């Protein structure tokens, strides 16, 4: 009942005892495996109790002093109000633990290093905007990127929700034409359609930074133009392919996910944007080369005079490596923090080992940890992984419309 986990490069074996804690049921049954799919009153007290017992054991404070104390004041807080507020340190410990538990995150070696901005006293979209702008400018930090999460007020009934309607704080526009097809990013066509539907002047280009749609409780959302000086972008050039610059490609510095629902101790914050720094294959492989994304693969391959007539020339593979080389080169030249998929996976192997020592395991979604290029060249490929849900966590959540 303790999963045997092997690494096929070294031969080492470990057991994931930590898997025994899994709260929210996963999508997989004995009869079918759905791991490859992307999106598969006083119950609050169970999750509240568990999270507090975590915190105190983590500060080597099990069964003493403030432990039983803090247990009572949340027993009382929920008793009176039907909810509870987190101690500042707990909201910090929960944000760090959610990141620690995100199975699909390959950068969790960094999980202990996170800056939590507390926006729990937020009211109105104009309020979030400055909180977001503080985060953004803090996280960006002139390119020396720093992980951060801004936690907006939790959720209560009879009130609306705090929601950032964008999936990320920096997203590129996507525009249709007299022929349906898209200029810009097709992953944002919808929110790009909303932003114009809420009165934003649409640009022309293929790299217009979208305006934020911020929503305050029980209130239709307000458009916000991000300060251009606040959106650090990296023009993409290639170290030795002088024409790559001419392709006019750019990506933004800050990967800030603004659509996931932080969940700590049974409290659900539908607006808790977190941000780190990119891994280069996110940009160079998925964002630019996915056929439903910028789909630049063939364009770059033409410019390299590759043979696009036969699949076995590996022109796709060759042009994709160069797009990734441009990404890493351009971010480094702009001194923007970025990590290549080799460095990143190797650190994750280091993380798995730390977590084996610390908590006897680590929930890891194999298919998202293995990078989208050069899979078996990175060690995580040869590492078996166990996927389960631990709390606290980042969860997906419905689009706020």
Ligand X SMILES: CNCc1cccc(-c2cc(C)cc(N)n2)c1
Please state the residue numbers annotated as binding site: 28, 33, 36, 105, 168, 277-278, 282, 286-287, 367-368, 381, 396
Minimum CB distance to ligand X smaller for 289 or for 362: 289
Tell whether omega for the bond before 392 is within 30 degrees of 0, i.e. cis.
Answer: yes
Among the options 99, 100, 108, 263, which is catalytic? 108
CA dist., res. 279 & res. 277, Å (int): 7
Asked whether the beta carbons of 244 and 236 are under 8 A apart, the reply is yes
State yes or no: residue 2 binds ligand H4B (CB under 6 A).
no
Instruction: Pick the binder of Zn ion from 7, 17, 28, 347 (CB under 5 A).
Output: 28
Residue position matching structure tokens 């309020």: 127
* Span from 37-45, 188-196, 282-290, 362-370 in contact with ligand X (CB under 6 A): 282-290
Asked whether the beta carbons of 107 and 339 are under 8 A apart, the reply is yes
Cα angle 126, 256, 233 (rounded to 5 degrees) comes to: 95
Among the options 90, 282, 322, 355, which is catalytic? 282
277 has catalytic annotation = yes
111 has catalytic annotation = no
Cβ 397 to ligand H4B shortest distance, Å: 17
Footprint of ligand HEM on this chain (CB under 6 A)? 99, 102, 104-107, 110, 114, 147, 149, 257, 260, 274, 276-277, 279, 282, 339, 344, 368, 394
Cβ 328 to Gd ion shortest distance, Å: 17
Q: Of 327, 333, 339, which Cα lies nearest the Cα of 277? A: 339
Instruction: Pick the binder of Zn ion from 3, 7, 23, 35 (CB under 5 A).
Output: 35
- Measured from the Cβ of residue 59, the count of other Cβ atoms closer than 10 Å reads 12
Question: Facing residues of 233 across strands?
Answer: 252
Instruction: Pick the binder of ligand H4B from 233, 382, 389, 400 (CB under 6 A).
Output: 382
Q: Of 44, 91, 45, 95, which Cα lies nearest the Cα of 72? A: 45
Q: Which helix (H) or strand (E) holds 359?
A: helix 341-359
State yes or no: residue 259 binds ligand X (CB under 6 A).
no
105 has catalytic annotation = yes
State yes or no: residue 367 binds ligand H4B (CB under 6 A).
yes
Burial 95-130 (b: 16+ CB within 10 A, else e): bbbbbbbbbebbbbbbbeebebbbbeebeebebbbe
State yes or no: residue 366 binds a second copy (CB under 8 A).
yes
CA dist., res. 384 & res. 401, Å (int): 38
Cβ 183 to ligand H4B shortest distance, Å: 23
State yes or no: residue 234 binds a second copy (CB under 8 A).
no
Helix (H, G, I), strand (E, B) or coil at 20: helix
Strands 163-164 and 212-215: antiparallel
Minimum CB distance to ligand X smaller for 266 or for 273: 273
Round the CA-based radius of gyration of the chain to a whole number and report it: 22
Contact of residue 375 among Gd ion, ligand HEM, a second copy, none (CB under 5-8 Å per partner type): a second copy
Contact of residue 8 among Gd ion, ligand H4B, Zn ion, none (CB under 5-8 Å per partner type): ligand H4B
- Measured from the Cβ of residue 243, the count of other Cβ atoms closer than 10 Å reads 11
Active site residues: 105, 108, 277, 282
| Residues of the shown chain interacting with a second copy in the complex, contacts defined by CB under 8 A | 3, 5-6, 8-10, 16, 19, 22, 25-38, 280, 285-286, 289-292, 297, 311-314, 316-318, 320-321, 324-325, 328, 332, 340, 342-343, 346, 365-367, 370-377, 379, 381-382, 384-388
């Amino acid at each position: 009942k303790f999963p045997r986990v092997k690494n096929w490069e070294v031969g080492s074996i470990t057991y994931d005892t930590l898997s025994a804690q899994a709260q929210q049921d996963g999508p997989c049954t004995p009869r079918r495996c759905l791991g490859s799919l992307v999106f598969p009153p006083e119950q609050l007290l169970s999750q509240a109790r568990d999270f507090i017992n975590q915190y105190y054991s983590s500060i080597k404070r099990s069964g003493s002093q403030a432990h039983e104390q803090r247990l009572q004041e949340v027993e009382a807080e929920v008793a009176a109000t039907g909810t509870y507020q987190l101690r500042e340190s707990e909201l910090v410990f929960g944000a760090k633990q959610a990141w620690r538990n995100a199975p699909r995150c390959v950068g969790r070696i960094q999980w202990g290093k996170l800056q939590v901005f507390d926006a729990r006293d937020c009211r109105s979209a104009q309020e979030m905007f400055t909180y977001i702008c503080n985060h953004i400018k803090y996280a960006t930090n002139r390119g020396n990127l720093r992980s951060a999460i801004t936690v907006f007020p939790q959720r209560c009934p009879g009130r609306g929700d705090f929601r950032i309607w964008n999936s990320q704080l920096v997203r590129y526009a996507g525009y249709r034409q007299q022929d349906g097809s898209v200029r810009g990013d097709p992953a944002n066509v919808e929110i790009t359609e909303l932003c114009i539907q809420h009165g934003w002047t649409p640009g022309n280009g293929r790299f217009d930074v979208l305006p934020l749609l911020l929503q305050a409780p029980d209130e239709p959302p307000e458009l916000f133009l991000l300060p251009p000086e606040l959106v650090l972008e990296v023009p993409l050039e290639h170290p030795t392919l002088e024409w790559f610059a001419a392709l006019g490609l750019r990506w933004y510095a800050l990967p800030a996910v603004s659509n996931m629902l932080l969940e700590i101790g049974g409290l659900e914050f539908p607006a808790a944007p977190f941000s780190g720094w990119y891994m280069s294959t996110e940009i160079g492989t998925r964002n630019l080369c996915d056929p439903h994304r910028y789909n630049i693969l063939e364009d770059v391959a033409v410019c390299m005079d590759l043979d696009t007539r036969t699949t076995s020339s590996l022109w796709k593979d060759k042009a994709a490596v160069e797009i990734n080389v441009a990404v890493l080169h351009s971010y480094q030249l702009a001194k923007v923090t970025i990590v290549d998929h080799h460095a990143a996976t190797a650190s994750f192997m280091k993380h798995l080992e730390n977590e084996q020592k610390a908590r006897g395991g680590c929930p890891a979604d194999w298919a998202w940890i293995v990078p989208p290029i050069s899979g078996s060249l990175t060690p995580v490929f040869h590492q078996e992984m166990v996927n389960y849900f631990l709390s606290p966590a980042f969860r997906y959540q419905p689009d706020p419309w």
